[PDB]
Design a protein around this nucleic acid. Sequence first.
RNA 1: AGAACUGGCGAUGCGGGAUGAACCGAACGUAGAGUUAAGGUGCCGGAAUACACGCUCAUCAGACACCACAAAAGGUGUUAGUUCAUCUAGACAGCCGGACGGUGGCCAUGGAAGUCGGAAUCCGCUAAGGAGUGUGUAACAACUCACCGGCCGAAUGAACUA
RNA 2: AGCGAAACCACAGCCAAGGGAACGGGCUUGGCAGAAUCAGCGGGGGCUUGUGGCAGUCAAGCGUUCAUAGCGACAUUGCUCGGCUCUUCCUAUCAUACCGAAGCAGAAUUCGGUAAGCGUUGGAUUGUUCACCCACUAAUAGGGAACGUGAGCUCCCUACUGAU
RNA 3: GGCAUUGCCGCGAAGCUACCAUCCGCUGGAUUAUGGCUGAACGCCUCUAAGUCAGAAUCCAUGCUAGAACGCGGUGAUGCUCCACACAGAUGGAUACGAAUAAGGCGUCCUUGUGGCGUCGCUGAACCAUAGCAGGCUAGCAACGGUGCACUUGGCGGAAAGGCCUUGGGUGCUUGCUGGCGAAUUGCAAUGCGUGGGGAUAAAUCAUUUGUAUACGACUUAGA
Lengths: 333, 52, 197, 27
Amino acid sequence: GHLGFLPRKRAASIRARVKAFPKDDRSKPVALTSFLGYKAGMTTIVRDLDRPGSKFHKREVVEAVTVVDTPPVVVVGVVGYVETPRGLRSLTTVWAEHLSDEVKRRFYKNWYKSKKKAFTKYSAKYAQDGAGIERELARIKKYASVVRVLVHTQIRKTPLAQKKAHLAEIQLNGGSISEKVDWAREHFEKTVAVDSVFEQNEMIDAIAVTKGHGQRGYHSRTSINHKIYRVGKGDDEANGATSFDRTKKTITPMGGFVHYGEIKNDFIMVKGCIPGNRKRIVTLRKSLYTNTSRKALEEVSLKWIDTASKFGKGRFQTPAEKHAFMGTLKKDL
Amino acid sequence: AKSLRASSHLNAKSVKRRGVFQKAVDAREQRISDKLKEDLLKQKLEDLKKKE
Amino acid sequence: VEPVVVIDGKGHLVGRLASVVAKQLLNGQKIVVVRAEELNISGEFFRNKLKYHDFLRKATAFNKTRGPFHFRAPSRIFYKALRGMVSHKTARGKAALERLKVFEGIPPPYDKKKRVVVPQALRVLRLKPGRKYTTLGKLSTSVGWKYEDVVAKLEAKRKVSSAEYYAKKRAFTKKVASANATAAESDVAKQLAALGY
Amino acid sequence: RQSRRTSTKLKEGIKKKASAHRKKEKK
RNA sequence: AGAACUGGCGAUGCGGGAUGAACCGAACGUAGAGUUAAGGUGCCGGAAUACACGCUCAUCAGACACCACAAAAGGUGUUAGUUCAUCUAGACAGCCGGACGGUGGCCAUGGAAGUCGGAAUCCGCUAAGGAGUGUGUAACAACUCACCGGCCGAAUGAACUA
RNA sequence: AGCGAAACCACAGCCAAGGGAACGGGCUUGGCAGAAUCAGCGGGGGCUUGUGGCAGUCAAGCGUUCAUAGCGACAUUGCUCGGCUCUUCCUAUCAUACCGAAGCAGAAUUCGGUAAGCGUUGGAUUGUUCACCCACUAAUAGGGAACGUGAGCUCCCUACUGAU
RNA sequence: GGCAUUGCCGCGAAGCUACCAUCCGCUGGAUUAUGGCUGAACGCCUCUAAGUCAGAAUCCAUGCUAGAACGCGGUGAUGCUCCACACAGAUGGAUACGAAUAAGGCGUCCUUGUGGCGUCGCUGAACCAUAGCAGGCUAGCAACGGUGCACUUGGCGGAAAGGCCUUGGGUGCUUGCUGGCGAAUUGCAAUGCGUGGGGAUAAAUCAUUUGUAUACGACUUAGA
């Protein structure tokens, strides 16, 4: 086997962590660098390949893509790390007062017995014009090279019963640290959209903990360069409808995904297969650099999204496709 | 044959860097400054539903 | 003498320096070495860069991880060097490299406090003038140390913020060296001189 | 790389080569 | 390899040689004090990061041990010598000038003039010019150093030894 | 959950090198090393290299005196009972990488240099295998790790993979 | 269909799981060989000696895996309260420029410089502190300073800041100067902050539940 993947041992968490972060462009205004979500099955996809110089130029091409449930995500804190001779050293993190039940729940292993007294005497540290709070912001604003944001999943929106929000650090590649903080100041408690991190037709890498078996498996793996096909939004009906097909249907197959629910909010559709399995948390980073290849230049024209039920077999797409073929039966009339 | 760490593909994928996919990020960067900043304005509407 | 003798590599010869830094702990002498990176040596560069890698290869067979660990960062480079002349392993030893401390740069609380050197071990003063002589910094780097800069940069800072200091002091004195000058030559004084002072 | 320790079988297998050079010269 | 002789270990500790059957010292009652042997005195290690004169840079120096094997040589590394030769009658290096006349010697031959070759390598002029040391040409030319000479102003070159 | 042996037992059991004697397990010099414990494997117990020897024009020097006691370096003249898996390392490189040389036009070839990063096949023969041939591929390089993987072939200790 | 050591056949989701399938598989330095540039040694020349440019699938980073179980940081939550007990070598001062060393401080004039003039170094053998019962108790003079102590104003320090300065007042002390008292007999040396129970309250574990995990552990979930 491969030597570099040693020790082949258990990951620390269900949530694998972003080892690297994208560099910096100081000319840009402030931008997030990554985003989190949950793996949700595999779907078949067809489109015409507008790749020049190709043996499959302009022809129809069929490929399996994974959909990842990515809800809008909420800031609860900002962090400042100083550069040291010894690397990096978070000198201060600072939070946002109005924390949700989901975030607080991350601070208790036993939520039921608890007196739920968590960010409380810290919330009374907030209760004034600022003073102590605005001090610790100025602390960061003075020193510290990289400014990272504390955020958590909106898991109540999720069709998962795990109920306990995941915390993940995501840094900021917007230039000047004065801007960095004065972007995190305004964006405390505010929910952050998925389409405001990634567009369609983009290369991204993904992180996830791998499908455990019986030691074998259950390692953190990062795959690199994967094209986002579709960014959909939960408020817009007909996600399955392309510019071609245009029949009103959701990307969710008839009766939800395999061991995963209805997709009642925003999602990402990524080329090929993300590591791990459905339910697992994945964090998507924006590829560290600019990989200008014709593999990355092409803007895709999706044709049709296979929304057949993968549980068992799928001969049809919508419930409207069952009774147009069957007609009408016993229990109906 | 050339490696990934060879001098050929390093020079080739250095010239093309300043293409469209530095500006497509900037075109999306405004949507971060638009709808996410509209989330600041939408919650300011509900705060004016509470201040009334 | 002094309880803590913050030294300072800046132009010393990894060896020698060491040795003495060594003896001195063995004879119960709290030291502290600074600016490790500006430590020197003997010979070209493309040497120390050998007389090393070799060292590098070393490492263990069956289990690479358990073996001669090759530290990069200067400090340590020089450490070793020294934990190599002190029967380390034996109370009296451990009891030493217990007494030691080797920072790269010159962080607080030492920034603020006089240092010193160790004749009997400066490039300038031992190397036949004009002869090949390596300078850690590179030599570290060349083989892993990821910071040369941080140090560097987060340096220049220090130097500054200091010199500045200086001044303020140079300004001060001057005044003294002036007061004493004038209120010098009146009896009392005189007298002293006779004795000498 | 080569070593600079003399193993004792050599260090004394030099003496027993040097002794053979003594009796060779005389004859 | 065999023979003779004299030691050492064998019955034998102790200091030294990082460690050891064959090496260095030194043959032992129990102590204190002094002096040393052999070996050392950057640190591990008790003891001069002593003094003095030199030599050496090594891309894994050297501290390698009757200086014994790979060793006879190689090197535009370096320090000293030895023996031949020029040297203000101007040397060494260097741009500059001449570098010729029978003659484009003679056989070879489409073509050979110094220069694809074969056998002689003469003679005259001079300061000095090889019947020629190379580049080049179909053959010539032009260039060439070797030998002078002028411009400059002192030590230089060759073979070797360590 | 109960009941419950024995064999065995000087003593412990980490590597690397050195410890002259097919002796390393305690020593010397290093690397190192944190209590406690469970589950695997079938894991272990200054040698040499490239150009023959014989007679000779050789020809620097050394030979008691010094070519003729005589040797003598590189040259040139004469005759003429093995081989199928899986690990690791070596460069003395077969391909791939970049150069240097060639009457090397181009394509291809030959020789040489730095380099061990990455690769190195399949079929008829076994009276003792002590031979080889066309088929592909970029190329189908040579070796070491001693009874390598013959306790994979015709209830002694611990490395290692992981787990608390 | 009661049953057939898993009765046979047709097909089948869930799973075991495969080149028998699909997706993915990176860019910066520094080099060897080599080609150079300036250019000595050696009044020419020369890629080299001092310099310097480019350059091999190499090297080293970037990226990828793990995270030292005795490496570290930041942040959330209250230990608090009542009783009973228990107590690797300080001895005046770590006395802050940086860079060079075929060079440098320090002072001064400015023509603001690689500037001039002056001067220093040849050891910290210095500097600053340094007298009082191991440092007492009291009387003035002269200064308007030195210094100790809790306070207070403002500022600086993120590399391991966890210290460094300053403003204002109070209170000591002052050996700067002069005093006035005490020292014995110590006999001639032998330095002179945890427990064991309670009470109130933060949380973890067990037990239960879930399965993305699983040999057992461990891991993930859920429950006033």
